[PDB]
C-alpha cells in the first residue's frame, strides 16, 4: 500500500523502452506515495491503470512531457507538498502535448483531490487540456497553506465540452457527472478548515485533512498529521514514557514509530529506526548506524568514529561523479554512506576544472568495498576492463538513495563483457537498470529475484548482447556453479559453489585424502596445511593450518 516516489524531475529517461515498466513496478497497488509522483515522457498508448489506487502523495505531483491523453488519478485525495516542484508547486502539469486525434493530456480527472497542504499549482503548455479553468483551486489549498502561488495557462487548441449539468456551480474536472468538484473548505461554517457540508455539524475534526464523513477523528478522509490505527492525531505515541517519581525511561507498549503520515509498530525493511522514534533512510546529524542480530539496523545519536561518505552526502552532497579528484577518499572503505556514480567525465577528465582522467588502476580503491547505502550508477567504464570486478567484494547496495529516485543499480553505455559482481547478494530497494551494453553477457545468468527484497523491484534490461549470441559463442556459467547462476565466465564467478572453494575458485574436491599439497576443509573451503605435515597415505592429514593440528612430522 505504501510505495516510494521518484526524484527525476524533467530529466529524460535513458531507457524509453522500459520507463513505463518502471512506473508500473513502482506504483501498481500503491495507495500512499512516499515522495514525488512523477509521470513524464509517457507515449500516447501508455496504459496507466496501475495508478488507480494512489490516494496520497507526500511530496509533489509532476505530470510533464507526456503524449498520453489521460492520467487516471481519480482516487488521489491529498498532496502534502513536503517536497515541492521547483521548491514552489505541489502540482505541476507541463508540456503535455505533441511537438487522427492528437496526443496530449485532455483532463486532469483529480475528482477526489480536495487537499493540497503546501505548495501551489503550475499548469503550462498543455494544448489539449480542458477544465483546469473550471476548478475552484483555492478550495483545494489548505487553510494554512503558506505557499500557494499559482500560475495556470489556459491556452488550448480544442473546444471543451461543458461540465455536466448535474455539477453544482459549473465546477468539474471533466465532462462526466462523476467529475463535479466537491468543495470542502470555502463552504464551511465557522471557518473550520474542512467540512462535508455547509452546517457546523458538517465541520471535520481538526486533525482531518481533505475532508470527512462525520465529526470524529476516525471520520477523516486523510490525517493532517498522523494516522494512529484509524485515528488521526497530532503525533504518534512515544516509544518511551517516564516513571512519574524517578523519570527513568520506561518502554511504552503502545509506542509507535513515525513513518510518513502514520504510526507504525516497526519500521519497514531497509529503513532505520531512530531513538527519536522515527523511520529514516538517512540518519539525522551526529548519529551512527548499528546493525542488530536480525540484520535490522537502528540509528543512534552519538566520539563518533570516522565514516566514508559517498556522493550525495556531506562534502560530496553536490558532487556529480567519482573523479581523480575524490577517488582516493574511498581508500580502505568497507562501507560508503552515500552513492557512487561513474560518468563519461570521470574517465574523460574535465579540462575546465583541470581534472585529470580517472585511470583504470585507481578503481582498485574499491576492492575493500562491501556496502553502499545509496546507489551504484555506471554510465562509463574503462574499455580495457572487461567487468566490474573492482566491486567484486560488494555485498549489498541498500538503495536508501536511488538514482532518479528509482534505480539502485544502473549500468548503461558500457563496453564490459560480464558483471563480475560476485559478492552482490542484496539490492535493498530500487530497481536495477542494465541497458545498451553492447558486449555484456551474463545478465540472465544472475538470479536477480534473490537480490531483491520487496515486490516493487525488478531488473529492467534492453539492448545488451543478445542471449543467443552469448550462447552461440559458448559464454555460459561454469559447470560447478550451482543452478547455473553466475556473474561471469569461469569457476570464480559462481553465485554459489556446487562443491568447495579454494580461495576464489570453485573446485570439485579439496585435497583432503589425495593430491598434493594436502588441505583441510572449513566451511566448504580448501585451506592448506603446514608444509611440515607428512601426507597421510590413507586418512586425513590436517585439522588446521598450523603445526599444532598436524598428524605426521610443532611438527617441525
Amino acid at each position: 500500500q505504501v510505495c516510494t516516489g521518484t526524484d527525476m524531475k524533467l530529466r529524460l529517461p535513458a531507457s524509453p523502452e522500459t520507463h513505463l515498466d518502471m512506473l508500473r513496478h513502482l506504483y501498481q497497488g500503491c495507495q500512499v506515495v512516499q515522495g514525488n509522483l512523477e509521470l513524464t515522457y509517457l507515449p500516447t498508448n501508455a496504459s496507466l491503470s496501475f495508478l488507480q489506487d494512489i490516494q496520497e502523495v507526500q511530496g509533489y505531483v509532476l505530470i510533464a512531457h507526456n503524449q498520453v491523453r489521460q492520467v487516471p488519478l481519480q482516487r488521489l485525495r491529498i498532496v502534502r507538498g513536503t517536497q515541492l516542484f521547483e521548491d514552489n508547486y505541489a502540482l505541476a502539469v507541463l508540456d503535455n502535448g505533441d511537438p487522427a486525434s492528437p496526443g496530449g493530456l485532455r483532463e486532469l480527472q483529480l475528482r477526489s483531490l480536495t487537499e493540497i497542504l503546501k505548495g501551489g499549482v503550475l499548469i503550462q503548455r498543455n494544448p489539449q487540456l480542458c477544465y483546469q479553468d473550471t476548478i475552484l483551486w483555492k478550495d483545494i489549498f489548505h487553510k494554512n497553506n503558506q505557499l500557494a502561488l499559482t500560475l495556470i495557462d489556459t491556452n488550448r487548441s480544442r473546444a471543451c465540452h461543458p461540465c455536466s449539468p448535474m455539477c453544482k456551480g459549473s465546477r468539474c474536472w471533466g465532462e462526466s457527472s462523476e467529475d463535479c468538484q466537491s468543495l470542502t473548505r470555502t463552504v464551511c461554517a465557522g471557518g473550520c478548515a474542512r467540512c462535508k457540508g455547509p452546517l457546523p455539524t458538517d465541520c471535520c475534526h481538526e486533525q482531518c485533512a481533505a475532508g470527512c464523513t462525520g465529526p470524529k477523528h476516525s471520520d477523516c478522509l486523510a490525517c493532517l498529521h498522523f494516522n494512529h490505527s484509524g485515528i488521526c492525531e497530532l503525533h504518534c505515541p512515544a516509544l518511551v514514557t517516564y516513571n512519574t517519581d524517578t523519570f527513568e525511561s520506561m518502554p511504552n507498549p503502545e509506542g509507535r514509530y513515525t513513518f510518513g503520515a502514520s504510526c507504525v509498530t516497526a519500521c519497514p525493511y531497509n529503513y532505520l529506526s531512530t531513538d527519536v522514534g522515527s523511520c529514516t533512510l538517512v540518519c539525522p546529524l551526529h548519529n551512527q548506524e548499528v546493525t542488530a542480530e536480525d540484520g535490522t539496523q537502528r540509528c543512534e545519536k552519538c566520539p563518533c568514529a570516522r565514516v566514508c561518505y559517498g556522493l550525495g552526502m556531506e562534502h560530496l552532497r553536490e558532487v556529480r561523479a567519482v573523479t581523480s579528484a575524490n577517488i582516493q577518499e574511498f581508500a580502505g572503505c568497507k562501507k560508503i554512506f552515500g552513492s557512487l556514480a561513474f560518468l563519461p567525465e570521470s574517465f574523460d577528465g574535465d579540462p575546465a576544472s583541470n581534472t585529470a582522467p580517472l585511470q583504470p588502476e585507481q578503481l582498485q580503491v574499491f576492492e575493500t568495498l562491501e556496502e553502499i547505502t545509496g546507489y551504484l550508477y555506471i554510465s562509463a567504464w574503462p574499455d580495457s576492463l572487461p567487468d566490474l570486478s573492482v566491486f567484486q567484494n560488494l555485498q549489498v547496495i541498500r538503495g536508501r538513495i536511488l538514482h532518479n529516485g528509482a534505480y539502485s543499480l544502473t549500468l548503461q553505455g558500457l563496453g564490459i563483457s560480464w558483471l563480475g559482481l560476485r559478492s552482490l547478494r542484496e539490492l535493498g530497494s530500487g530497481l536495477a537498470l542494465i541497458h545498451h551494453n553492447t558486449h555484456l553477457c551474463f545478465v540472465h545468468t544472475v538470479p536477480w529475484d534473490q537480490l531483491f527484497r520487496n515486490p516493487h523491484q525488478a531488473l529492467l534490461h534492453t539492448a545488451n548482447r543478445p542471449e543467443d549470441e552469448c550462447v552461440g559463442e559458448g559464454l555460459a556459467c561454469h559447470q560447478l556453479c550451482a543452478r547455473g547462476h553466475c556473474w561471469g565466465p569461469g569457476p570464480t564467478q559462481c553465485v554459489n559453489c556446487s562443491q568447495f572453494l579454494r580461495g576464489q575458485e570453485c573446485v570439485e574436491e579439496c585435497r583432503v585424502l589425495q593430491g598434493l599439497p594436502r588441505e583441510y576443509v572449513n566451511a566448504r573451503h580448501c585451506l592448506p596445511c603446514h608444509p611440515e605435515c607428512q601426507p597421510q597415505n590413507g586418512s586425513v592429514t590436517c585439522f588446521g593450518p598450523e603445526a599444532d593440528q598436524c598428524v605426521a612430522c610443532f611438527c617441525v
Partner: nanobody
Amino acid sequence: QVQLQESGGGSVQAGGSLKLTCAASGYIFNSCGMGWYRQSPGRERELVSRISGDGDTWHKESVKGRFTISQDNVKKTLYLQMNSLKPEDTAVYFCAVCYNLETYWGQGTQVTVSS
C-alpha cells in the same frame, strides 16, 4: 479593489543593476507567498524569487547570489534588487501576491540587459 503595480524597469549594460518595486494597494497581504515572475519573448512566465507567507525566501538558481527580494510592510511594497545583471535576465518582470489562497498579478515591467 486590490491592485499590484510594478515599476523600476529599465535598460542596462551587462553587469548593471536595477531595483524593481511592486506597490500593492487595497486590502491585501502576503498570506500564502509573494514574489517575482519573469517572461522572455517566446518563453514561459516563470518564478524567479519568492517569499512565502511565513517568511521563507527562495531564488531560482540562475539568479541566486545576484537577486535580492525584500519587502516594506509599512509602504505595502515588494522589491527585487537585481545586481550583476546578465543578458539572460532580459524579460518582463511581474510581481505576484498570494492572499487568501488567490494569486494576484501586476502588469509587468520590462528589464533589458544588453550584450
